[PDB]
């Protein structure tokens, strides 16, 4: 694939953001954290897929070129924001564009991959969401996926 | 969890125990993710 | 905001103090050192921005009138001790009022521009909390006040 030089420099910068070990190669444990901080969202099951594919050697820290190749594959398929908007409007029932904060928190905590309650609480706190009054999902989706 | 049971017992001041056990037993999971109340939870609430 | 005559005279005095060339002009690195030492703190990215704006084309080495002109177009009023304090609090990963020495050195070395280790050790020593390995942010801001 094609990777621009500025992209490669940013990949080097992110490759040791939390390399407190000093090895210079980021571990698979925070690798998903690395991608999420880099603007692309890997699925946790997909994250385990990459971990199993790369950690066959058992090193525990992903090699840089392998990370670049998988990152290029990630940018090969980019999720559309409108898909997230469709999912959110599907979750809402009244069609008013507003969803209850408690209902969304419950859905996140229970269904599928569990989300720590602190993560959700920080999500409401940052996104100025009000617990008592339903908050429009469209503005929050736009601000989060400003891209 | 039993901690959930204790938090329940904290917030069940007004309702009578029979009403509480009725309402908790007659709850049903409307959606997929939620799961039905386990009998041990009913027992813990009753003895508490 | 054009500079007053007294400030221009003080700036020329600083120029002379850094006029290692002695011909009334200084190099780009010397000019950036002047900018940083003057009290205003334009980022290394900002310093490069003004350097590329001048391009070192008017006189090869930046002269005093061009310095005055770029000041006229680059007043730095954004500096504020409270801004320093809030930026330090945001920088504090722990959030317990103490920024780890390891965290700050790792960030300076890797995050953003690459920073030399000697300088980082200089800041850790000047914080006088080198032994603890965790610099108190508040006292750091109190001597930032002079910076």
UniProtKB/Swiss-Prot annotation, chains A, C:
Record's GO cellular component terms: calcium channel complex; calyx of Held; catalytic complex; centrosome; cytoplasm; cytosol; growth cone; mitochondrial membrane
Residues annotated as domain EF-hand: 6-41, 42-77, 79-114, 115-147
What keywords appear on the UniProt entry?
A: Acetylation, Calcium, Cell projection, Cilium, Cytoplasm, Cytoskeleton, Flagellum, Isopeptide bond, Metal-binding, Methylation, Phosphoprotein, Repeat, Ubl conjugation
Cell compartment(s), UniProt: Cytoplasm, Cytoskeleton, Spindle; Cytoplasm, Cytoskeleton, Spindle pole; Cytoplasm, Cytoskeleton, Microtubule organizing center, Centrosome; Cell projection, Cilium, Flagellum
Q: What is the effect of changing residue 119 to A?
A: Decreases interaction with SCN8A in the absence of calcium
Q: How is it modified after translation?
A: Ubiquitination results in a strongly decreased activity.
- Please give the residue positions where the record annotates the modification Phosphoserine: 80, 100
Q: Which PROSITE patterns does the record match to this protein?
A: EF_HAND_1, EF_HAND_2
Q: Where does Ca(2+) 2 bind?
A: 55, 57, 59, 61, 66
Q: What other facts are recorded?
A: This protein has four functional calcium-binding sites.
Q: What is known of its domains?
A: The N-terminal and C-terminal lobes of CALM bind to the C-terminus of KCNQ1 in a clamp-like conformation. Binding of CALM C-terminus to KCNQ1 is calcium-independent but is essential for assembly of the structure. Binding of CALM N-terminus to KCNQ1 is calcium-dependent and regulates electrophysiological activity of the channel. The C-lobe interacts with KCNN4 channels in a calcium-independent manner, whereas the N-lobe interacts with the S4-S5 linker of KCNN4 in a calcium-dependent manner playing a role as calcium sensor and gating the channel.
Q: Supply the name of the protein.
A: Calmodulin-1
The protein's gene is named Calm1
